Design a binder for this molecule. Structure first.
Ligand SMILES: Cc1c(O)cccc1C(=O)N[C@@H](CSc1ccccc1)[C@H](O)CN1C[C@H]2CCCC[C@H]2C[C@H]1C(=O)NC(C)(C)C
Lengths: 99, 99
């Protein structure tokens, strides 16, 4: 899939048995998900936006299906208004920018 | 140019006679620039990211030279830690996501 940028680049994801919609976000170093139930141990973490900072729960080695592509990585969960797939996961699904 | 996402997708911009580095940011609807001197009138604006909101100055129909591609559009100036080229300007340089 090629994707133009006239609308937000939103994709379907499956994480922890759940279907979510998420933003492909070349500006995000990290993947950040809205409040959800993920199984397993987590670490405290703080990440910075535009913005200020939010407190998130850090989860390592999480399987996530992004637009029908499987990828494993660190997922962060916390009070983000929008699900963000950052570059740690974008590189796993072979995502490039072209201009 | 094609650009992988193993590093931050940073490009050179010329805006208001000045050279800057900026992040190609598919997760940003707007272009946001660190405090700088831009000539002419502006409007007050508030923009939300992760962490909260920042007060910005809104400038319309600004000429921006992104990686040797000329584009005109709305640029926002305010206390962002990184220069962001959002989708309003990404569509002007024929920027697509490929995976
Ligand atoms: C989530 C995240 C990380 O995990 C790591 C590094 C940065 C970020 C981060 O917040 N990145 C953002 C750009 S703002 C930015 C600030 C500093 C460095 C790089 C980018 C997102 O790419 C875009 N970001 C995605 C999304 C984040 C939650 C709030 C709604 C949007 C808002 C949008 C945004 O901020 N828009 C502006 C117009 C204000 C620029």
């Amino acid at each position: 899939p090629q994707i133009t940028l006239w609308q937000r680049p939103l994709v379907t994801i499956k994480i922890g048995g759940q279907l979510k919609e998420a933003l492909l976000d070349t500006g995000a170093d990290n993947t950040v998900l809205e409040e959800m139930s993920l199984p397993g141990a987590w670490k405290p973490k703080m990440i910075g936006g535009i913005g200020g900072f939010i407190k998130v729960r850090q989860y390592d080695q999480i399987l996530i299906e992004i637009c029908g592509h499987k990828a494993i990585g660190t997922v962060l969960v916390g009070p983000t208004p929008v699900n963000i797939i950052g570059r740690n996961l974008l590189t796993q699904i072979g995502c490039t920018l072209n201009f």
